[PDB]
Amino acid sequence: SNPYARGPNPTAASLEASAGPFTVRSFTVSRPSGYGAGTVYYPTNAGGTVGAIAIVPGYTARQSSINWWGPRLASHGFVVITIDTNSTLDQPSSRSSQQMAALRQVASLNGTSSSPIYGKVDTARMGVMGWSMGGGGSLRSAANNPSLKAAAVQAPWDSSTNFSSVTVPTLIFACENDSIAPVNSVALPIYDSMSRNAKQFLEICGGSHSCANSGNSNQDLIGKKGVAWMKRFMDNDTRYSTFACENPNSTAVCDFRTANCSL
Template sequence: MKIKNRTACTTAAPSPARRRLAMASLAAAGLLCSFTAQAQVAVFQENFTSGLGSFTAAGSATNSSGAARLAGCYGCTDGAITSGPISTVGFSSLSLSFDRVTSGLDIGEGGIAEYSTNGSTWTALETTRATSNGRVTFNLPAAAAGQTGLRLRFRIDANLSSETYTVDNIQLTGISGDGGGTNPHAKGPAPTASLLEASTGPFTYASTNVSSLSADGYGGATIFHPTNVAGPFAAIAISPGYTGTKSTMTWWGERLASHGFVVAVIDTNSIYDQPYQRAPQLMAALRQLVTFSNTSSHPIYRKVDPNRLGVMGHSMGGGGTLIAARDNPTLKAAIPLAPWNTSTNFSSVSVPTLVVACESDSIAPVNSHASPFYNSLPSSTRKAFMEMNNGDHFCVMNGNDFTRIMGKYGVAWMKRFLDNDTRYSPFLCGAQHQADLSNSQLSEYRENCPY
């Protein structure tokens, strides 16, 4: 929230003659200020706790005492830092705040803050010298909203290396388009059928590997995480099936990360691990994601919300998903995919669970696995059952024919229950969902709406 907005909400006491009218005005102003405080959420932030963080450097640009220090240079390149692309899709009323300090600048020199919507044309927000130190806030024009590649740049125009411009605690905030802006977990534009059915969502993402030697309690992982939108994000761990590896499930990691989740697609300790062994490995992976998020040198530093965790898995990994949901009621969502398990009783599960089945599954036949698993879930638990028409046991893996509809429901389920984002409810219960029931790729769908 901007300091100047707080100041604007401070009003002197009215004269007696105008007290009633003034008190009514103050009450209205108080409501307006309260709404604005709720509506402003972080779109992007950088505190330079780990080098220059998400910024790339040119010229003399270094991390000094946890801030970006830019120095001048005579006859060579002055210091500058430029952010990667930042998604402002789904946000309005953007505001940029940062701390800056200049030192030794002469007339005609300055520290410059600017932004670009295309990466080539830059608009200056300010050029400052030593008399303008402190924290500042700038309201960006409406054209900066709704961009997939907004960039920020800070640079110095000076002649000497002793002349510096130091920047820290950069924060870009905006009003989220979540139907009022009151949900801090809601990220991205309002969902549409075409957005959910596309192969990737609104955010760019990166991946990083966890080796078997670095993994704590599981066999290794590839972590997929958003790169052009501020966290923290809900986190999801995904297990492959019997004899499978993480490489069979990467499409889920990519799809979910591009919609604003941190996703660990894991290898298990043994490809022959049973469901009861995969469940604790899913939880171990989630715990390590939280640890990585608390480690300043890790790529997912500050990206994981430890209170919003979910699990997924295929086949025996799906059985492990159900067991993890049963044994860890603090989980927020679960999606077992063509699940296999020796027990069909999950009557104590309270975690919202979407069971995905493959109609022609001969390895985990629907009538003896996915269907009784779903039926055993209590009616008090938010649940759904989705069966892929004529799909075999591998219909949920990479290269399947159901990615549009399956990815749509997988993302919507996680958005609704991990992010508490009710903008996705119509795709699970409402008119959008009803339209999908005639989709030829669905052979059956059950649910206990509303949610």
């Protein structure tokens, strides 16, 4: 049996819903260690330890741009930290270092008897997410820390599009009409550079650069996919293989690519 499987068998409609099966609570990190600020989202009733995910915004941006993922993922059985960077103008390398410091602090709080997440985290199972420069930072985190179990980035941007060393399962949401980090010159080159991993590319029809951010009109599809990808790869949960690897019939999806995503 899979010791990391949590929750009932999913369906497309239940993964499209706004909340998964677990109750979510949250707290503000009191003394952030190596990053600006953090909010920790966690399930109260997951039925065992769960993996941890750290999410980073883009240039100038704060937690609110990316924090819908917090309850979306936590309610399916994850501990999620959404961070503010030390400076809103930090670049992708710094964002990556901060993202890894936030994972480090989730692991420390897992061992802190006073923390709400004491004993809730499997600190051997971690993932990285982020928007734009925070997505570039996440890809650098994955390249530099190949024990990470999954990455899921949105409208990623970085100074280099060559992420060929990444062996971490990587999902990319791209936004069709993005003029900040365009699909043709940024998101698809990043995707195409990776030959050593499970990977996926989903282009959202008509989406602006913020098409995967909090308040987007496609939280059903985007949230299904992000949760399925993290469940499949962070939990090794093959009940999620169908949803993680599926080529969606969604009017929100304008392009789909995947490789090494076994059904």
